[PDB]
Symmetry: C3
Subunit: 174 residues, 3 copies
């Protein structure tokens, strides 16, 4: 059985991220370029800060026909004391994609399946829907509030941005 | 339970790959050297272009007694409209290895198991057999044609090299 | 069914590891810094050399309040002819963590679950406890001996450090 889990990834530009290592044959992004990154992670309902994303985008090619890039991404999603989910697969700056769920820890131990990545605002706002299989238990309620429908205009709740107790999960990852 | 899927990975020298990021203090490959790469991917029967490989080889050590290198590889295999498979493990230029199937997406959602990598012609031709478990359905027939036995002089079908509809899968990855 | 497996990872300073690829604009570790690494791997009881670890640590942030770093790690554990385990997740220099088991090969084909990482000496001695699901068979007895109590003072058996037949597994990874 699938448990859907949605999250918002936001680059608030206060984590030194992205760091672009530019090595390619080309002026534009190309093979050789590496982009270590880490962004903030909020619940799908945008009410709470949960943690961070962390990992590496490997540039594969520039896609001039689509005015964008293909990356191959290896990274994790951190949910404070709940644990983390890890993923591998395509990040395309110009369209939605699906990544493999490579595993998890904590409540996410045994996780498998795929996750849909939707870019909302390039490069600062992304929305994910994990189609989670293999979990030992029902996901905690504070993570499964009805998601805010994805649009360019979404914002984390002000109390979550401000890191107030009501706007964070316990020991949210930073 | 297990569905065998074989593919040929071929470097046709037209994707700027591999890109060597040199950091080891050695004329040979060494720890510190990073190799982002992307090659073309064909069906096991060599009749169709399916997509590409994409990811990163991390050099671990030069192995002089084996006249080759040990890499640690993290990458994906793209199958056009069907989805992708992701892997992690040893790439040894000097001998066959098995990598872990970390997951998949699309028709490969839920994939697990191991994949045999056969070093056919260094570095331009590699042959893989995925021992796929966890798939929802039987693989599409166009992916499971009897593989061409691996040998040094294998070549994709001319229709596949030329990207004719008869020689590609739909939305083959490029 | 869960099988527990513990191993010690030791940097014996003879594998050119770690290699620091410095890209952050600070004397301290920061986003942009990449650390390819490979250490030796011994049984939990420290009687036998089994192989190596191999992969990449991506620096995510310096954590000044904890006098340490957060890495995001992608790597494998090699057990000679037995195969390997692959992992994805957090390495925090200042506290224990859990990483996701992304898959395996050989006797570890089908492996999933999570692994505890405990740092004993930064960066030269670490102790792991894998909580392994999905294995086809019981772990071999030579891998499941009672672990030596974890501390800063642990050392491999002299036969294992010296690579004597009684102190190594069959075709231990090097």
């Amino acid at each position: 059985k699938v448990q859907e889990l949605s999250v918002y990834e936001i680059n608030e530009l206060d984590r030194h991220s992205p760091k672009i290592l530019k090595n390619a044959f080309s002026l534009m992004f190309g093979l050789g370029d590496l982009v270590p990154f880490t962004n903030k992670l909020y619940t799908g309902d945008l009410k709470k800060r949960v943690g961070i994303t962390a990992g590496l985008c490997v540039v594969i090619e520039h896609v001039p026909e689509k005015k964008g890039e293909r990356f191959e991404a290896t990274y994790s999603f951190y949910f404070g004391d709940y644990g983390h989910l890890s993923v591998q697969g395509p990040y395309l700056t110009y369209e939605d994609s699906f990544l493999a769920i490579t595993g998890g820890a904590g409540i996410f131990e045994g996780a498998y399946g795929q996750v849909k990545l939707q870019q909302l605002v390039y490069p600062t706002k992304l929305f994910y829907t994990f189609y989670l299989k293999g979990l030992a238990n029902d996901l905690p309620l504070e993570l499964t509030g009805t998601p805010v429908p994805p649009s360019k205009d979404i914002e984390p709740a002000p109390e979550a941005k401000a890191l107030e107790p009501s706007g964070v999960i316990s020991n949210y990852t930073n």
